Amino acid sequence: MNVDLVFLFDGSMSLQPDEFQKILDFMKDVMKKLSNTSYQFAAVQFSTSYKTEFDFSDYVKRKDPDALLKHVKHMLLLTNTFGAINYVATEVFREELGARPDATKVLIIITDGEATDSGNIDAAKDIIRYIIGIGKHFQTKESQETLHKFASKPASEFVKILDTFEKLKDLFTELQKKIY
C-alpha cells in the first residue's frame, strides 16, 4: 500500500474543544493502525489560513502520531476549504517535502461546515479525494451534496457523512474491515 495520504482538517471556530480533539484522535488512530505499512502521512490544518502541521519527511522520522500532532494550535477562524485544497495540491504533495513520485496520492478532508470561500481546485485532479462531513450542519441532503464538489467521483463512495463526532470511531472500524 504505497500511499501518500494527507489529512486536511477543519480548525474553524465552529469546532468545540472536544470535537477538535476527536478529529486529532481519528488521525492519530488511523496513522497508528497503518504504521507497519507503506503509508506515508502529512497533515494540514485549515481555517482562514493553512498550516502544514507535519510533512511526509517529518512523519518518516519516527512515525510517532502523538508527537507529530502535539503542538497543534486550534486556529478558530473561518473555513476556506477551496483554498485549502489548492494549498495541499501545490504546497504539500512535493518531493522536496518527502512525497514519493510513484505513490498514490490521497487527500482526506474532514470538516463540520460549508466553505466560506470559493476557487478552482483543478490542481488536485491527480489526487484521490475523500471528504468526511460531520455534524448537524450536514443533516439535510441538500447540505450534504455541497460536499460532492470537493470529492472524487462517485460521491456515494468518496463522501462520508457522520451525524456525530463520536461516529469517527465507527468510521475507522468500517475502514479497517476493508483491508483484509
Residues of the shown chain interacting with ligand 2O7 in the complex, contacts defined by CB under 6 A: 3, 5, 30, 33, 106, 108, 130, 132, 160, 175-176, 178-179
| Shortest distance, position 37 Cβ to ligand 2O7, whole Å | 8
Question: CB 120 → ligand 2O7: shortest distance, Å?
Answer: 24
Q: Which residue's beta carbon is nearest to the bound ligand 2O7? A: 130
Contacts of 108 (CB under 8 A, 6+ apart): 5, 6, 7, 8, 130, 131, 132
Residue appearing with cell numbers 504533495:
93
Nearest to 130 by CA among 5, 1, 3: 5
Q: Which is nearer to ligand 2O7, 60 or 175 (CB)?
A: 175
Residue 78 or 110: the one with the smaller Cβ distance to ligand 2O7 is 110
User: Is the peptide bond prior to 17 cis by the omega test (within 30 degrees of 0)?
Assistant: no
Angle at 164 between CA 161 and CA 86, to 5 degrees: 50
Q: Which is nearer to ligand 2O7, 115 or 151 (CB)?
A: 151
